[PDB]
Design a binder for this molecule. Sequence first.
Ligand code: HEM
Ligand SMILES: Clc1ccc(-n2ccnc2)cc1
Length: 465
Amino acid sequence: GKLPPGPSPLPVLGNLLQMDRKGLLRSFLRLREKYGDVFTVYLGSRPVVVLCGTDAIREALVDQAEAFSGRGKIAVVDPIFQGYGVIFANGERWRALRRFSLATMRDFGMGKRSVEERIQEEARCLVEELRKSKGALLDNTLLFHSITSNIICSIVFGKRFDYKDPVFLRLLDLFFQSFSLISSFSSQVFELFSGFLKYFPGTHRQIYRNLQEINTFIGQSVEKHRATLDPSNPRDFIDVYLLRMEKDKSDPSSEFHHQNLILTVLSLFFAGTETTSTTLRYGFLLMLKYPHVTERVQKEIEQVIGSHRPPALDDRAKMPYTDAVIHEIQRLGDLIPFGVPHTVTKDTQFRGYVIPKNTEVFPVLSSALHDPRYFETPNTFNPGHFLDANGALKRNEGFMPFSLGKRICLGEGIARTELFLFFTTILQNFSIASPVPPEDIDLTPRESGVGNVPPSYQIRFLARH
Ligand code: HEM
Ligand SMILES: Clc1ccc(-n2ccnc2)cc1
């Protein structure tokens, strides 16, 4: 049986000595050199199994997507989730919420259409709020978080917030700031010595007080939604959850109990707002480094969508180039370097090693988007990776930014749609430009932990006439 190869760990400390100074990801890469694609590492006491390569990630999450369908714990945030919510819940509790939220939000907009029209709309706004900026050097960080947040809030909270609404701007600002702490160094030195450090002050405390405020807003908005619930017509995700939360109060095992409502509404409100938004942020920072790549996208929009009607989702097909630039933005982006933690649900048999039940598994996704076996020139923005000789969209076994298996990003649908509608609708109406010389544009992440934060930058949105 035995666990995969890795360095011999010391008591308490685990393989802390073999760890690279830069952080976790870098470390897993420096060990893959000595052991290869699949190997074992001990983060302090807890042994994890790292997975590198496009192959290893699928042989596990795709070909045995049941023994790996288990969610692990993320150091700094377990305190607030304690295993609840739809993202961190396990076993039956997981399927319980997963299916519910996947179904609730779906037949409430998501799925397709109702949301598409919602996005073209939110985008329409993002376009007039940008005209207002009269193309003055701004910081799209906040604004971006807004447009992707509204899309999700309309599904969960049902309502939509104004771009300059103080409350709204605080949750957003809170999400951003928090993701940045969740991906900092402590958020990692914690993963290791969480039990050790938690007794002393640090950023781990700040991540708590942060999610707190949000949980409040979530919570105090559950009350508002409470006294206004017209069972004959639910308004959003909260109502539906409320209708079934009240319904099953005779089954003291129904995972539908506040704890979840808040933590699930937080999982969908944080992710739904966070990633899609910083992907575009990274996207555009990449559109300044390569202005010649923008001209094309703005031309492909011109041939297809023309320029007298907002981009529709259908257009993603007739626009194979822009599709590839996005897959490439997403690929180089790599917002989630080593995917949210996993765990085998049973004694699993993998490649010749026997991973005991409940053993944490990290699917280094970064080493799948950057894999040389599937991506020629993986470290170079190359819309080619996703195209054939006849210049058409081509699939690629290495493109797994949302991940794979039963734990695959619940919101892959929305996201891919939001990206294509916002991204083109903007480039359709505006033409980015920034004071920094393209060769000087740096894409190195500002923070790289469980998440990759693109450095902050200024960009002006010159209107196109
Ligand atoms: C730029 C877009 C996005 C990217 C790159 C992304 C990334 C991912 C990744 C890498 C995971 C972990 C998969 C795993 O367990 O191995 C995940 C999970 C998750 N994401 Fe996203 N995500 C995106 C947007 C969204 C959106 C728009 C929502 C909200 C509707 C969302 C909600 C979720 C949820 C609920 C999970 C947990 C799923 C589960 O436990 O089964 N994400 N996503
Ligand atoms: Cl702790 C954590 C992990 C993943 C996500 N996420 C973001 C987008 N999809 C998943 C949010 C929070």
